[PDB]
Write an enzyme that holds these catalytic residues in place. Structure first.
Site, PDB file in Angstrom:
ATOM      1  N   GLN A  13       0.855  -1.192   0.000  1.00 44.15           N
ATOM      2  CA  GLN A  13       0.000   0.000   0.000  1.00 44.15           C
ATOM      3  C   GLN A  13       0.896   1.249   0.000  1.00 44.15           C
ATOM      4  OE1 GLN A  13      -3.064  -0.764   2.875  1.00 44.15           O
ATOM      5  NE2 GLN A  13      -4.454   0.858   2.175  1.00 44.15           N
ATOM      6  N   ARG A  15       0.586   4.196   1.266  1.00 45.94           N
ATOM      7  CA  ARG A  15       0.773   4.549   2.670  1.00 45.94           C
ATOM      8  C   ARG A  15       0.842   3.263   3.492  1.00 45.94           C
ATOM      9  NH1 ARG A  15      -2.645   9.906   2.869  1.00 45.94           N
ATOM     10  NH2 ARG A  15      -4.315   8.463   2.246  1.00 45.94           N
ATOM     11  N   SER A  29      -3.299  -3.207  21.338  1.00 45.37           N
ATOM     12  CA  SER A  29      -2.133  -2.646  20.646  1.00 45.37           C
ATOM     13  C   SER A  29      -0.932  -2.330  21.565  1.00 45.37           C
ATOM     14  CB  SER A  29      -2.517  -1.409  19.821  1.00 45.37           C
ATOM     15  OG  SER A  29      -3.320  -1.755  18.700  1.00 45.37           O
ATOM     16  N   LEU A  36       8.782  -3.757  18.105  1.00 43.21           N
ATOM     17  CA  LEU A  36       8.101  -3.141  16.981  1.00 43.21           C
ATOM     18  C   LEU A  36       9.188  -2.893  15.940  1.00 43.21           C
ATOM     19  CD1 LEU A  36       6.558   0.030  16.056  1.00 43.21           C
ATOM     20  CD2 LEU A  36       5.823  -2.315  15.648  1.00 43.21           C
ATOM     21  N   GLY A  53       4.173  15.699  11.329  1.00 42.91           N
ATOM     22  CA  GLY A  53       3.130  15.179  10.460  1.00 42.91           C
ATOM     23  C   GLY A  53       2.009  16.181  10.351  1.00 42.91           C
ATOM     24  N   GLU A  54       1.264  16.108   9.264  1.00 46.50           N
ATOM     25  CA  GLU A  54       0.626  17.337   8.777  1.00 46.50           C
ATOM     26  C   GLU A  54      -0.751  17.672   9.421  1.00 46.50           C
ATOM     27  OE1 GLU A  54       2.745  16.728   5.308  1.00 46.50           O
ATOM     28  OE2 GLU A  54       3.688  18.750   5.446  1.00 46.50           O
ATOM     29  N   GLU A  87      30.510   2.912  -0.448  1.00 44.04           N
ATOM     30  CA  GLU A  87      31.974   2.868  -0.398  1.00 44.04           C
ATOM     31  C   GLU A  87      32.482   1.522  -0.883  1.00 44.04           C
ATOM     32  OE1 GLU A  87      33.699   5.656  -0.726  1.00 44.04           O
ATOM     33  OE2 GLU A  87      35.158   5.180   0.847  1.00 44.04           O
ATOM     34  N   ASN A  88      31.697   0.478  -0.662  1.00 41.77           N
ATOM     35  CA  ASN A  88      32.029  -0.816  -1.237  1.00 41.77           C
ATOM     36  C   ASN A  88      31.819  -0.841  -2.757  1.00 41.77           C
ATOM     37  OD1 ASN A  88      32.836  -3.674  -0.809  1.00 41.77           O
ATOM     38  ND2 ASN A  88      30.738  -4.095  -1.504  1.00 41.77           N
TER      39      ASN A  88
END
Lengths: 193, 172
Positions: A13, A15, A29, A36, A53-54, A87-88
């Site tokens: 998804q 989001r 929860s 987590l 966050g908006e 860098e590798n």
DNA sequence: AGGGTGTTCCACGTGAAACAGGGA
DNA sequence: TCCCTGTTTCACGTGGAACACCCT
């Protein structure tokens, strides 16, 4: 700005349904939050450049009663990783397949396309493409490559053919002393028409 | 580096132009201040701690809810302005909004199209002589025709069926 | 092969306007 | 005669399905 990078690797998804899937907490929860995904912050997930966050009309006004405000960061392992991997990626002494690994590692762990990858390492993008298709070959073929009995050109013709075909053509490539050119022709008539 | 860090330290300005943070309503988080802050470790004590450019969320919540909560008494223009605001003052997809206010996405669209109408048309809808049934049919139309047809609606008191038919001919 | 958006057109229940009694 | 009330019917704007265009 945080989320567009959060979603970046491999979700089904657009989001990541990880901030809204709080759904109804249902006293269920805070129990299995446990180990987590190692980095997050509450309503809005400031990555390394912390930010906010908006809108969150809904998500920040449900809140919860028992919180984990714990500031924990994971990022450093990943970014130290990125510098180590880039860098590798530029190394004089790398067999085709290890290189291909690091290309695939960067291409998968992060999103920036193989074109940019190619810009870093200074080669064409169809090159990063082919060095990476090198990984799908038979093990007779990879052994042969590493062993320098054959070369990336040959091996790069062999991709997409079953193992039986691969190992016949490989057997021809060695002891018929074939050239990448002869190899491409010989392989040609074993691919579909 | 260190030199620049002593620099803004001596200088009154600290941030000659203040840093930008957010307020969690519980905690404070940065926006583009690494420079200012890390430097301001050599300086003393908390040294912003007053109104400087920062974004606050509680305010944005009040906004969010005043928007989401309207007594259904508003005419189509503040309604439109609220819909727009909900995707303008914050970025939203029209679908999501349709879900919030319990209307179809189409309704949201047309209501918002109402905001791009001639001054004459807009002022005849805030006044009570035109409806949205009427007004939305005059959208994407040039000013001169908006004026023409508008006169025809008000003058002859056409039903939106009329109005849609009449304005149909002035459309490709 | 997909969502986001603009634009057209007409279904729909509301509310009332018209009609019909009916009680004087 | 007039007013009141029971009933049928359909015009209206509202809001939505549907169509059509981008943007990918």
């Amino acid at each position: 700005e945080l989320g567009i990078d959060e979603v970046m690797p491999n979700p089904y998804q657009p989001r990541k349904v990880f901030s809204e899937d709080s759904l109804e907490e249902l006293a269920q929860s805070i129990k299995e939050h446990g180990l987590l995904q190692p980095v997050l912050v509450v309503s809005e997930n400031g990555r390394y450049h912390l930010i906010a966050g908006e809108r969150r009309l809904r998500a920040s006004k449900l809140a919860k009663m028992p919180t984990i405000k714990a500031i924990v960061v994971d990022i450093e392992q990943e970014k130290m990783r990125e510098v180590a991997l880039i860098e590798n990626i530029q190394r004089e002494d790398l067999n085709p397949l290890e290189l291909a690994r690091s290309y695939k590692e960067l291409l998968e762990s992060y999103q920036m396309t193989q074109e940019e990858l190619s810009k870093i390492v200074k080669k064409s993008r169809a090159h990063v493409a082919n060095i990476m298709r090198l990984l799908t070959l038979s093990s007779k073929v990879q052994n042969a490559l590493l062993e320098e009995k054959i070369t990336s050109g040959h091996a790069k013709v062999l991709v997409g053919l079953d193992g039986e075909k691969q190992e016949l053509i490989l057997n021809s490539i060695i002891g018929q002393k074939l050239s990448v050119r002869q190899t491409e022709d010989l392989a040609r008539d074993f691919k579909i028409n």
